[model samples]
Target chain A: EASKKPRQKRTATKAYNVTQAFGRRGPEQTQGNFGDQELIRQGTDYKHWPQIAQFAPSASAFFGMSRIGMEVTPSGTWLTYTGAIKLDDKDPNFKDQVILLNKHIDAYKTFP
Target chain B: KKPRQKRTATKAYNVTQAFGRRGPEQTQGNFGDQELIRQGTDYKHWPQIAQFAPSASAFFGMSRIGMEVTPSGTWLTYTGAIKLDDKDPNFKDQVILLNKHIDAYKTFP
Candidate 1:
């Protein structure tokens, strides 16, 4: 049967406009770009986003990311979380959650 | 001083990207060794990471990332570099790279 040896499902595109996306689309999606050449191209700062909530905790490029901690019940394509993050430095797009996200970001950098 | 340009950029996400010299110390522990998951935790796994082993939450970012080593010893993984999805032989539903990206962010602090 053709089903006997179907290729794995690695060719699927991720859902980017869903609830768990945390609002990581639109112009915001095109914003917050970074690059480091030292990373490639003979000598240029490659540009990228950690998608790790490089700035906004309310959202990031990491889609379907359920804030649910350490638990997987429903089966499908989904993601989970569980840890502390602290800033390795500072941010410029923050307003209120600054102190909070920083606490975690810093912890991740200088865990002691 | 002319109130320097500040010379800054947001590195909270890149913070964990500190892998040039701190390679050994960083890779050796991972989320489990770092206790980011903790011992005797209720998670027991996420069925997943609450008990992630060598889950390497730190390396979760390594998913979409890649690098090449020049004969001279220089290495780099450009951002624009494309990546394919990652999956486990047993759990095909849970995408490794994407899920790891999810874990990289929402995980409790």
Candidate 2:
């Protein structure tokens, strides 16, 4: 869909890990869209880092922050959760967070 | 890294982290318009196409101490810190007056 506001491009081309919670659908229909029910269904910790909670907290919050890093939203997202803020790609905690949100602003194909 | 400033150890729940705005403790104007976004020499308002308020997001450099709880050596960025003033009387924090929800932030970090 063509957005009313033209998306801004980011100066930094950092690749991030986005979560698959949205199940490959558009934003409006992605609230409970989980790509992998087995994994998240069990409430298991992130294999690599559970500490991502302190930084990203939630998948949506992660999206808000990482999207900003990728310049997905110019002013940052006031319309969503603020548990997290933009994380530098160089941050050691960055990788764990990338899984929560990505630059492309798309949901992961699958989550396991 | 030690915080540049320390917050008072109070459980009043008055301190809250707010971002996308200016920090409250920034009257000295002791900063500039640019911030180092990347770990390298790249320092500017970011996205350069858009302009950001100075100290709109303060981390290790300043304001994190009284602003939010964070691990040492790590930094967090947001618009700024806000210390809610109860004197406004509009702030319904007193339990006797109004039992506020466990927290205003439900979908929060």
Candidate 3:
């Protein structure tokens, strides 16, 4: 018989508000010299725009895997949002959101 | 008597800095107690003690103004001494310092 040890399970730990730290990324994100220090926001983004839209009321950046997307008006404002559903939230979904948000930040690193 | 025609007497004026002293109420003023010193840039006073200290010597333009020292001796003069992002831990973001600078300007203006 094989050894009987259960695998470790994922968990959602801390929650963060991203906007108060960084304001909107510059309207452009590619091949522009936006300067390094100006783009970075040292604290959480406090604007809370997504919450104000009242669709994706809250999102947590955890340390698991999850899918996320957003829809914007043709005029270019956030309209709707969706996330990869979490069956057991303590599963890998939490880490996925953190990875996704980090990628979002990286995409907005429009400056040299 | 011939030139008594017309002569105007002009009184000469003398200017002096007042140190808030009046009549018998006068007492010797030290840097600590005097509102204004008759001397210019004299470093012998209580507040000047800090300016003349070795620590203050390293920084140029280190002079004391009456408004720079609070009643409790808080030094507000160095408010412009350096870049805000360099030393302040609470200044994790520049907006804090920006707003602070704006408020100070509004108050002083």
Candidate 4:
């Protein structure tokens, strides 16, 4: 039973283990519209993680901002941004561009 | 030494094993803005289930939609046409309420 098992310790190594697992997906697959059903299906698996539910709101906000042109109307909720945000292949400021987008996402405001 | 084995399955399940090995966090802890990390970690444990991703983009096609999420995480991404004349008086308000909550999380991390 789960109650019989010892709780795992939080360690930097453990954190890296989690990181390494994600690292296998490769940058190419992760960089663009790498929308994999396998990835999405796992949403239910992690549903029980501590502070996991906290991500939905955060993700909704981030996705709303980053996904594309958010057209907030008087009538309904709509998804505007189409497709994944493609990074420029030759742009030296790729990381900076992403960082800027993140800043914008954080600063995004909705209609009153 | 024996010959090396070829992995017949295209999908790797190592992520699942690692995720399975992970113990639950007793507390939220002090990890600041670690949602991405947790998400990534959770992604590892997912088994390969054959299913198509939802057409999430379609939620925007219609007008007068409302969305809500309960504390249990059961959520409606789009509850459409709440403003229709045939609907209840508070239908639009319901939509507005969800929209307001949506806005509240707009700046969330």
Candidate with top lDDT is: 4
- lDDT (Cα atoms) of all candidates against the true structure: 0.23, 0.23, 0.21, 0.24
Ranking by DockQ: 2, 1, 4, 3
Backbone clashes in model 4, listed as residue pairs = A68-A81, A75-B64, A76-B64, A76-B65, A78-B60, A79-B60
What are the per-residue Cα lDDT tens digits for candidate 1 across A12-101? 112211111111112221111121211112111122223322321221111111122233334333233222223232335333334432
Residue-by-residue lDDT tens digits, candidate 4, A1-112? 3222111111112223222222221123111111122222242233322222222222222222222222346754332322222234255854554443333221212211
Q: Assess candidate 1 and give its lDDT.
A: 0.23
Model 4's lDDT to the true fold?
A: 0.24
- Residue A89 of model 2: what lDDT? 48
In terms of docking quality, model 1 is: incorrect
Q: In model 1, how large is the Cα lDDT of residue A49?
A: 21
TM-score of each: 0.20, 0.26, 0.15, 0.18
TM-score (C-alpha, index-matched) for candidate 1: 0.20
Interface RMSD of 3: 32.9
Better of 3 and 4 by DockQ: 4
Instruction: Evaluate model 2: give its lDDT.
Output: 0.23
In model 1 chain B, the worst 10-residue window by lDDT is B1-10
Query: Which prediction has more favorable lDDT, 1 or 3?
Result: 1
lDDT of 4 by residue, B73-105 (tens): 322222221122224465455344334322232
